[PDB]
Design a protein around this ligand. Structure first.
Ligand SMILES: [Cu+2]
Ligand SMILES: [Cu+2]
Ligand SMILES: [Zn+2]
Ligand SMILES: [Zn+2]
Lengths: 154, 156
């Protein structure tokens, strides 16, 4: 009745350390992402479903990009807007920001009400960014998440 | 449309200093609680709607309990169960844990999908607890929230 997603650090070199898992469950109000992660910087981290089932690095615009092969934020409706987990006008893959505790662990459960079934996650990937997520494309694109820190294929 | 709740520290004496405000807005997926608070301990704090519109202290077992007049967790369905914001079998007033950043501010928005209209908060109070919230009555009752750190009555 649940999915367990192993998350690993993303380097320009390839894949890095395993930093734990995220357990995805179904609730009457949407999918609940319960992290069991370690080794993250305290604070709020951008957290999204990406289109492709890969965490491999790649080259873009002559720049090394960790976990580039995951593609962009999951966007089956082709909205082209990053508007967060509570706005149906943006990427379906926009999840609530990941909450990292003072000791670098992540445990606080995150409800994504726009996702209703675990079947919607199959063939995709989960991404944790270095920066946060203000659920907007301003003042920074894609909520300000920036580089990809960790990634896991579903 | 939107509601703004001023929050004040709750003490044996009475009402303490203001710690900021919580802005409640309506979304198609439920009420969104956006805090703007300062001066809390970093970590996750139990965060619940309480039944009665008061933050005044009261006496219980030979002691002045902070914000006791607020009553318990809002529970119109008389479940008597603390099961958190995603479980319809427990207190309706169970909100997601309040996230306090490392610097002691609270800013992360909290969606309570079981609450649909701001009118459901009228005549009640918001409470922030010292402890966290595991959305269960085990191992500790009421999610482990413990004492009442801050409180605010829902006005307008
Ligand atoms: Cu992302
Ligand atoms: Cu409470
Ligand atoms: Zn997005
Ligand atoms: Zn409760």
């Amino acid at each position: 009745n649940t999915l367990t997603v192993k998350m690993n650090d993303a380097l320009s070199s390839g894949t890095g350390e395993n930093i734990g898992e995220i357990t995805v469950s179904e609730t009457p109000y949407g999918l609940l992402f319960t992290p069991h992660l370690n080794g993250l910087t305290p604070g709020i981290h951008g957290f999204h479903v990406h289109t492709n089932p890969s965490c491999m690095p790649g080259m873009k615009d002559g720049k090394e990009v960790p976990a580039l092969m995951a593609g962009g934020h999951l966007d089956p409706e082709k909205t082209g807007k990053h508007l967060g987990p509570y706005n149906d006008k943006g990427h379906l893959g926009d999840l609530p920001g990941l909450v990292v505790n003072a000791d670098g662990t992540a445990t606080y459960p995150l409800l994504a009400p726009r996702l209703k079934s675990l079947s919607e996650l199959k063939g995709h990937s989960l991404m944790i960014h270095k920066g946060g997520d203000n659920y907007s494309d301003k003042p920074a694109p894609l909520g300000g998440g920036g580089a990809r820190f960790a990634c896991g294929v579903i």
